[PDB]
Design an enzyme around this catalytic site. Structure first.
Site, PDB file in Angstrom:
ATOM      1  N   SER A   1     -15.543  -9.959  -1.011  1.00 29.48           N
ATOM      2  CA  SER A   1     -16.410  -8.882  -1.520  1.00 29.48           C
ATOM      3  C   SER A   1     -17.872  -8.934  -0.983  1.00 29.48           C
ATOM      4  O   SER A   1     -18.078  -8.721   0.218  1.00 29.48           O
ATOM      5  CB  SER A   1     -16.265  -8.732  -3.053  1.00 29.48           C
ATOM      6  OG  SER A   1     -17.295  -9.335  -3.799  1.00 29.48           O
TER       7      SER A   1
ATOM      8  N   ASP B   1      -7.347  -1.070  -2.092  1.00 26.38           N
ATOM      9  CA  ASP B   1      -8.616  -1.293  -2.800  1.00 26.38           C
ATOM     10  C   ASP B   1      -9.210   0.054  -3.234  1.00 26.38           C
ATOM     11  O   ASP B   1      -9.427   0.932  -2.397  1.00 26.38           O
ATOM     12  CB  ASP B   1      -9.604  -2.053  -1.896  1.00 26.38           C
ATOM     13  CG  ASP B   1     -10.714  -2.763  -2.671  1.00 26.38           C
ATOM     14  OD1 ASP B   1     -11.138  -2.266  -3.744  1.00 26.38           O
ATOM     15  OD2 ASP B   1     -11.177  -3.826  -2.174  1.00 26.38           O
TER      16      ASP B   1
ATOM     17  N   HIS C   1      -8.602  -4.948  -4.957  1.00 30.07           N
ATOM     18  CA  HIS C   1      -9.782  -5.735  -4.604  1.00 30.07           C
ATOM     19  C   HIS C   1      -9.490  -7.235  -4.660  1.00 30.07           C
ATOM     20  O   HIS C   1      -9.758  -7.958  -3.699  1.00 30.07           O
ATOM     21  CB  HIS C   1     -10.962  -5.355  -5.497  1.00 30.07           C
ATOM     22  CG  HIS C   1     -12.287  -5.804  -4.968  1.00 30.07           C
ATOM     23  ND1 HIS C   1     -12.691  -5.581  -3.668  1.00 30.07           N
ATOM     24  CD2 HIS C   1     -13.305  -6.458  -5.571  1.00 30.07           C
ATOM     25  CE1 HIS C   1     -13.897  -6.092  -3.492  1.00 30.07           C
ATOM     26  NE2 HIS C   1     -14.291  -6.627  -4.633  1.00 30.07           N
TER      27      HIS C   1
HETATM   28  N1  LIG Z   1     -18.567  -3.625  -9.102  1.00 29.72           N
HETATM   29  C1  LIG Z   1     -19.046  -4.900  -8.545  1.00 29.72           C
HETATM   30  C2  LIG Z   1     -19.011  -5.952  -9.654  1.00 29.72           C
HETATM   31  C3  LIG Z   1     -19.710  -7.240  -9.271  1.00 29.72           C
HETATM   32  O1  LIG Z   1     -20.473  -7.263  -8.310  1.00 29.72           O
HETATM   33  N2  LIG Z   1     -19.475  -8.339 -10.006  1.00 29.72           N
HETATM   34  C4  LIG Z   1     -19.877  -9.660  -9.557  1.00 29.72           C
HETATM   35  C5  LIG Z   1     -18.560 -10.304  -9.161  1.00 29.72           C
HETATM   36  N3  LIG Z   1     -17.784 -10.518 -10.401  1.00 29.72           N
HETATM   37  C6  LIG Z   1     -16.537 -11.298 -10.162  1.00 29.72           C
HETATM   38  C7  LIG Z   1     -16.764 -12.518  -9.311  1.00 29.72           C
HETATM   39  C8  LIG Z   1     -16.276 -12.516  -7.990  1.00 29.72           C
HETATM   40  C9  LIG Z   1     -16.465 -13.621  -7.154  1.00 29.72           C
HETATM   41  C10 LIG Z   1     -17.150 -14.746  -7.627  1.00 29.72           C
HETATM   42  F1  LIG Z   1     -17.319 -15.803  -6.809  1.00 29.72           F
HETATM   43  C11 LIG Z   1     -17.650 -14.763  -8.938  1.00 29.72           C
HETATM   44  C12 LIG Z   1     -17.464 -13.655  -9.775  1.00 29.72           C
HETATM   45  C13 LIG Z   1     -15.880 -11.690 -11.447  1.00 29.72           C
HETATM   46  C14 LIG Z   1     -16.636 -12.053 -12.571  1.00 29.72           C
HETATM   47  C15 LIG Z   1     -16.002 -12.415 -13.760  1.00 29.72           C
HETATM   48  C16 LIG Z   1     -14.612 -12.408 -13.846  1.00 29.72           C
HETATM   49  F2  LIG Z   1     -14.023 -12.757 -15.004  1.00 29.72           F
HETATM   50  C17 LIG Z   1     -13.848 -12.042 -12.734  1.00 29.72           C
HETATM   51  C18 LIG Z   1     -14.479 -11.683 -11.539  1.00 29.72           C
HETATM   52  C19 LIG Z   1     -17.496  -9.184 -10.988  1.00 29.72           C
HETATM   53  C20 LIG Z   1     -18.788  -8.421 -11.294  1.00 29.72           C
HETATM   54  C21 LIG Z   1     -18.144  -5.294  -7.406  1.00 29.72           C
HETATM   55  O2  LIG Z   1     -16.964  -5.451  -7.660  1.00 29.72           O
HETATM   56  N4  LIG Z   1     -18.609  -5.432  -6.158  1.00 29.72           N
HETATM   57  C22 LIG Z   1     -17.728  -5.837  -5.045  1.00 29.72           C
HETATM   58  C23 LIG Z   1     -18.617  -5.763  -3.837  1.00 29.72           C
HETATM   59  C24 LIG Z   1     -18.341  -5.993  -2.488  1.00 29.72           C
HETATM   60  C25 LIG Z   1     -19.379  -5.850  -1.561  1.00 29.72           C
HETATM   61  C26 LIG Z   1     -20.673  -5.480  -1.973  1.00 29.72           C
HETATM   62  C27 LIG Z   1     -20.974  -5.239  -3.325  1.00 29.72           C
HETATM   63  C28 LIG Z   1     -19.957  -5.379  -4.255  1.00 29.72           C
HETATM   64  C29 LIG Z   1     -20.000  -5.184  -5.738  1.00 29.72           C
END
Ligand SMILES: N[C@@H](CC(=O)N1CCN(C(c2ccc(F)cc2)c2ccc(F)cc2)CC1)C(=O)N1Cc2ccccc2C1
Ligand SMILES: N[C@@H](CC(=O)N1CCN(C(c2ccc(F)cc2)c2ccc(F)cc2)CC1)C(=O)N1Cc2ccccc2C1
Ligand code: NA
Ligand code: NA
Lengths: 839, 841
Positions: free
Chosen positions: A697, A775, A807
């Site tokens: 991501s 995705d 995703h």
């Molecule tokens: N809508 C946002 C949301 C967001 O940015 N988030 C931070 C990440 N987060 C998860 C996470 C992933 C990887 C990691 F290493 C740690 C956490 C997570 C957190 C808690 C959980 F229970 C399960 C997963 C979810 C919220 C998005 O999807 N993008 C994907 C993406 C890809 C490229 C650029 C910007 C973004 C923006």
């Protein structure tokens, strides 16, 4: 300094290595207890004070368990509580909810409970169920066989909630409309007639009681209707139940297509994706008013809308961030944001603001006049910030001791640049505005005077209010429990403090672990799920109590273990946390996995694993052997592995997080390379000539930025589901960190790797792109359109698709392929001798 | 024998190489003259007999030219005709972009033109606009470019498929939003004839078209049109006339909808297409007719729309596809070639205009009109054929003028009798049909069949007459001869032939040997133009004058008249391949081409790149110039690869039994022949390293590339597969159901022919599979590649993937092609040819 080359295994051999090392991680990847609830026995003869209920996974499905909390404990030994099973037992929209909530586990995900009756209510599979335990009926000594709620509804039923006022009644969403069912009298009833189920989503865009994509994905709000907690009694000896609900209209929202998982069909699902710059859903509040007679028969349903339009009563509001009712059930509260997410408002909404929905103008005009002018929205709280508002769940309203005042605790970064608790009291003035005049209100006509603003906490650290973290108020002792980073940014800890005379902050959790805590509703117990870099996660119960001379002072005693630790994993050597002072004037933290069996004199290939976006902190003192196991595997195969929390990462303050505002992709690698060089100068086993970067991501986004901006350092970049083009990401996220594309033409240009395809290397075996074909979030077209411009530019690439994945990688075969491909790609283009010859 | 390794050039270097060698082929990739047409001058005092018209590309757009055919030539010299521009200079939609994909048109400009003989009226589309000029009619012959005259319109959308009315050259017709319109180019009267489609409605709601060929007919049957003018006009007592238009009406309501990615990737949207996949329904089809009454000065009095007296299902029992259609020369009947679903049963059917009755919804008036048409008025199946293999559709079908009322006489081509495609003069007696409509019963399976009075075979033997891709027949009715193209002299050369259709036997060859030819006969049968080439010499267009000895018109002799397009002359950086042949254990001689590596070192053995198509409908190996099209095969030879090409069984120009070899059995028989011919070359030439062989092709070629890696992973080190069909159940009816039958009657064929089903059989070693695909491919939908990757992911097998996101089934954008060639050369270098590729294992 001779270079170490990693052993060159075949594709089949690497698969066997990954198979073997993952073989004893079946028990390791199954869910620890959660959604804890303490319920008292009230049996002065019996040995147990409380029964605790919790969802857990005993490869099993996720289900309700319970355990017995003793009145006393043998302090010579360590009690381990036994898990009693409480019970005895995807669509498109179920799959998407699980994607928006990031739920990995199958089974019961959540549950409502009613205290007075002892009624559980939970969705499980297709059906909704209900059983009683712990109320008048007492406490079962064996598994319960649950009762299916029957239904005339043909399509799947989402988002079921118990009515707190009457546990016989429940509500749910069916085909984008609110229904209620009585679990005693079997009466079903559709409360809203907004969405025609038969019509296309292109034709019929309106829904009711649902949170739209943006609010689920970027504000973690999944429900969009709210039961009124009390019931107003009629003269008939019956009662009125009320449900506030959001009503979205997505008519003007752009319709994108996404590949359907059924690749057989060669078809495409339609989604409403408000991309950055475009129209969000048109929102408004509604209330269904439901009259019931003296034995659960519905007399009548009256659906009711706001007296004036939403754009008038709530000027400049775009998103309804959170909403609900005050504990008494008198007012309906809502936390509201502007488009730029730099201005938050908490607003009380009297039920008298709503009037019957009437298409006839005579009756509609008579109803507008029948509601007094004094009835008005009450903006009890407001805040602004130059950076942005981080929405959270912390908001506690107190009992209303005076008619004209309201008292509450809220959290905010807007005063100090650090999230802290504040006790506030707002005077509820009769508004300056008068509806009689036929004029529109001035922009501060609904604003309440602020009587009190005591800061409960303060310092260079934050209170946590997201991902489950919240507060717990003890109104007897006038205290408040909360999670925080006061002791360290690397460790979350539980704390308590008076909201009356806010003195020192008493810490409750033991230093050296990070903690995820949860307090008994009776403020006499707490459970900590904790770990550290060396020790796996474990869930333990601690009894709270006070000295006789001072109830403010809380102390804790260990009671029992709910989940025991697995103990240190034989293969797993954990990483060392390090820190370095940056030229940016910030301490940045890192993690370092040294290569296993470290040779004297030799230097090793180096994998930088990265996320580096907001709302995330990779580097902290928790156990990384489960989630980031393959970073340890990379160490065993000879790679140096580095992880660095650059600026923009969370848990360090709002100013730290705001470093990349309007500037996304431009600053993050500068910090990574600084951290990478700090290590090289201080450890000579890091071969800087062979450095790779990888992430998913946002991590994948920065992998592309690393190879683009700094190809001199990074040999290979493996980018997973990256946004290559900020204009095709949603409003809620992008506009918060980057503003409107018209007001940031250069930030958007510089932040979009697809607009800069000419700056990618003309050597092959450097760029590798990974993406979920299905995705819906970081739409595949990010990868497909970047490839279009790479082909225009004449630049090489390698591509790997995962056709059954959105995703996240959910299917194990897909994840096995990924781990195998990644390992082999690094071997072939970074680690091995053949890789060095290749150039 | 020591291994030769190819120079390990960088990515940036290989782009330079490919760019340099592409540089001096600006003139080479330009369209030669075509759509020729001879018009007589009729000027006793003038020095020119005929004037020829033709489409040509003088990096220019395709436009109309003319040249002057002299009455005499100086036979000492070689006359080159001057290209005179017919037109003066001018002052892509979705439906155009698809038509160009269906017609496989690469070039820009004017694609075609109609011509009315009696008036000199040309008619031609160019861009969205439809234009006309006059030249060679009563008015006379221009000596300067003409001003194209825009046909004005009130239609909002693109007007597609313009056709001149042969009965009146003022009236034209065209399709607009799936409905037939007519417009008068003098009076400016425009009019809509069919009211079937609603342009403002979505295709999911409204999928009824009128006068258009649906997807499968354009893609698989090469019929790109669904309406046909009646060539003569019936006069009314008023003073004016009736014009008639036969047209196919379709209803794709029951046809499955798939979604294809939109080319505008920014939208992240997909388009809806009616794709009838193998098994599912084809469109509900029927004949209709628009009766157009005109007054004395060209006003439309009235238009009556008419339909068949009984449904199409009853009148034409068994018929799925309308393969071809049109009118007889006199305009008495309309005709139609009609296939069944299995495409093993062809029918030619005459349809009287009196079969059509005015369209009526009122059951009272409708029932009265059914009784007013006589019971003798009936369908007439004038010819039927069947086959245990299949029916290859062709354009050869000549009806003669009709002298006896009860009889009709025609020429038709067929593989069914002999096993090879030959011409047959057939006479059919037109019975009043047994079936009688007044009864109220339905007709039995063959109540319309006509007695076959005559069935003379004009040709015969182990070779075919050609009737596809522009080949047809010219018919001299005066001398009673028929000209045609064929393979009689060789499968590797196409040649012009002539023979009598009265007393056949001898078949006179007219084109010279040692070349393959693409010929075209004057309507007056006194000239012929041949576009000829061979392996050594680039293509060349020349004009030859036909004539006879005084005593015997049958004895046809040619004489060179003038050059139209002179040969470019052998390209200095090009070595052509050697054609070879070998006796197969299958009992067929199979041919192939062989590019040796340039500067061949004695003793050293070289890596080998087999290039393939191998499916039906095409022959890659023949005596034609392969210097333009298959140029990069030579670029591989120059880098030090052997390049082999072999036409396996099921190929083309070798008769129907040869083609039928893979019936029900696609994927299974082809790689045997490829490996046999490859092993034949190894046993004869020892410079072929069999321990470093790679396979590569596009479309069916890519399909077989996968099959070769799957089936014979011992032989082929790498396999690059372009736009493959991985899974036959996802491909269309007309094609799949023809070669593989219905999937219910042949599970084992489909399973064995679908690589996605056999994902486990791919290798576990990486750097061997490379998948290529146009992301917007509407024909071989990308799902083939994606779903294959689904099961390769399941199976844990490795792959390389390349997408070309601007491309459909062809590669049109130049940047896209440049990348494909660069990646292909570099992949082959790093995983087959080079030294570092060897060390990689
Ligand atoms: N809508 C946002 C949301 C967001 O940015 N988030 C931070 C990440 N987060 C998860 C996470 C992933 C990887 C990691 F290493 C740690 C956490 C997570 C957190 C808690 C959980 F229970 C399960 C997963 C979810 C919220 C998005 O999807 N993008 C994907 C993406 C890809 C490229 C650029 C910007 C973004 C923006
Ligand atoms: N609907 C058919 C149609 C067909 O089978 N055809 C033979 C090929 N042919 C072209 C051609 C391609 C490659 C080559 F090397 C030579 C010719 C051609 C012909 C004339 C021309 F001007 C330009 C291109 C068009 C007709 C199909 O597309 N597939 C694609 C495909 C892919 C895999 C398996 C089966 C098929 C079946
Ligand atoms: Na979320
Ligand atoms: Na075609």
């Amino acid at each position: 300094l001779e270079p170490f080359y990693v052993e060159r295994y075949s594709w089949s051999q690497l698969k066997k290595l990954l198979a073997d090392t993952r073989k004893y991680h079946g028990y390791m990847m199954a869910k620890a207890p959660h959604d804890f609830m303490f319920v008292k026995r009230n049996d002065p003869d019996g040995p147990h004070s409380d029964r605790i209920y919790y969802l857990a996974m005993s490869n099993r499905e996720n289900t309700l368990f319970y355990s017995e909390i003793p009145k006393t404990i043998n302090r010579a030994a360590v009690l381990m509580l036994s898990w009693k099973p409480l019970l005895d037992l995807y669509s498109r929209e179920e799959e998407l909810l699980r994607e928006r909530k990031r739920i990995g586990t199958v089974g019961i995900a959540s549950y409502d409970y009613h205290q007075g009756s002892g009624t559980f209510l939970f969705q499980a599979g297709s059906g909704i169920y209900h059983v009683k335990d712990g109320g008048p009926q007492g406490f079962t000594q064996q598994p319960l066989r649950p009762n299916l709620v029957e239904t005339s509804c043909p399509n799947i039923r989402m988002d079921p909630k118990l009515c707190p006022a009457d546990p016989d009644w429940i509500a749910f969403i069916h085909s984008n409309d609110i229904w209620i069912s009585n679990i005693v009298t079997r009466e079903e009833r559709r409360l809203t007639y907004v969405h025609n189920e038969l019509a296309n989503m292109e034709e019929d865009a309106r829904s009711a009681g649902v949170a739209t994509f943006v609010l689920q994905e970027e504000f973690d709000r999944y429900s969009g209707y709210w039961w009124c907690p009390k019931a107003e009694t009629t003269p008939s000896g019956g009662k009125i139940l009320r449900i506030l609900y959001e009503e979205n209209d997505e008519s003007e929202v752009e319709i994108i297509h996404v590949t359907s998982p059924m690749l057989e069909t060669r078809r495409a699902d339609s989604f409403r994706y408000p991309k950055t710059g475009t129209a969000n859903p048109k929102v408004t509040f509604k209330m269904s008013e439901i009259m019931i007679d003296a034995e659960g028969r519905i007399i009548d349903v009256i659906d009711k809308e706001l007296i004036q339009p939403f754009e008038i009563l709530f000027e400049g509001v775009e998103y309804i961030a959170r909403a609900g009712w005050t504990p008494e059930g008198k007012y309906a509260w809502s936390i509201l944001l502007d488009r730029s997410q730099t201005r938050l408002q908490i607003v009380l909404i009297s039920p008298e603001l709503f009037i019957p929905v009437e298409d006839d103008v005579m009756e509609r005009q008579r109803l507008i006049e029948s509601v007094p002018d004094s009835v008005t929205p009450l903006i009890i709280y407001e805040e602004t910030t130059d950076i942005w508002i981080n929405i959270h769940d912390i908001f506690h309203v107190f009992p209303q001791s005076h008619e004209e005042e309201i008292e509450f605790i809220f959290a905010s970064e807007c005063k100090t640049g650090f999230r802290h608790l504040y006790k506030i009291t707002s005077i509820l003035k009769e508004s300056k505005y008068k509806r009689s005049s036929g004029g529109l209100p001035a922009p501060s006509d609904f604003k309440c005077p602020i009587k009190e603003e005591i800061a409960i906490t303060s310092g260079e650290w934050e209170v946590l209010g997201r991902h489950g973290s919240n507060i717990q108020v003890d109104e007897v002792r006038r205290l408040v429990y909360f999670e925080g980073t006061k002791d360290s940014p690397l460790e979350h800890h539980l704390y308590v403090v008076s909201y009356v005379n806010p003195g020192e902050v008493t810490r409750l959790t033991d230093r050296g672990y990070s903690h995820s805590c949860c307090i008994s509703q009776h403020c006499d117990f707490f459970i900590s799920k904790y770990s550290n870099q060396k020790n796996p996660h474990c869930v333990s119960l601690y009894k709270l109590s006070s000295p006789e001379d001072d109830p403010t002072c809380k102390t804790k005693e260990f009671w029992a273990t709910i989940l025991d630790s697995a103990g240190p994993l034989p293969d797993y050597t954990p990483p060392e946390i390090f820190s370095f002072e940056s030229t940016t004037g910030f301490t940045l933290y890192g993690m370092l996995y040294k290569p296993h069996d470290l040779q004297p004199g030799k230097k090793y290939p180096t994998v930088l694993f990265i996320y580096g976006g907001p709302q995330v902190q990779l580097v902290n003192n928790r156990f990384k052997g489960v989630k980031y196991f393959r970073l340890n595997t990379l160490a065993s195969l000879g790679y140096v592995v580095v992880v660095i929390d650059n600026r923009g990462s969370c848990h360090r303050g709002l100013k730290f997080e705001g470093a990349f505002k309007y500037k996304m992709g431009q600053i993050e690698i500068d910090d990574q390379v600084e951290g990478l060089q700090y290590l090289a100068s201080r450890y000579d086993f890091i071969d800087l000539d062979r450095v790779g970067i990888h992430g998913w991501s946002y991590g994948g986004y920065l992998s592309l930025m690393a190879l683009m901006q700094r190809s001199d350092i990074f040999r290979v970049a493996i980018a997973g589901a990256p946004v290559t083009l900020w204009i095709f990401y949603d409003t809620g996220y992008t506009e918060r960190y980057m503003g409107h594309p018209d007001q940031n033409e250069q930030g958007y240009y510089l932040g979009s790797v697809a607009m800069q395809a000419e700056k990618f290397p003309s050597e092959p075996n450097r760029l590798l792109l990974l993406h979920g074909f299905l995705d819906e979030n970081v739409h595949f077209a990010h990868t497909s359109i970047l490839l279009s411009f790479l082909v225009r530019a004449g630049k090489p690439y390698d591509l790997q698709i995962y056709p059954q994945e959105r995703h996240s990688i959910r299917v194990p075969e897909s994840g096995e392929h990924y781990e195998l491909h990644l390992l082999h790609y690094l071997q072939e283009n970074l680690g091995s001798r053949i890789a060095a010859l290749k150039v």
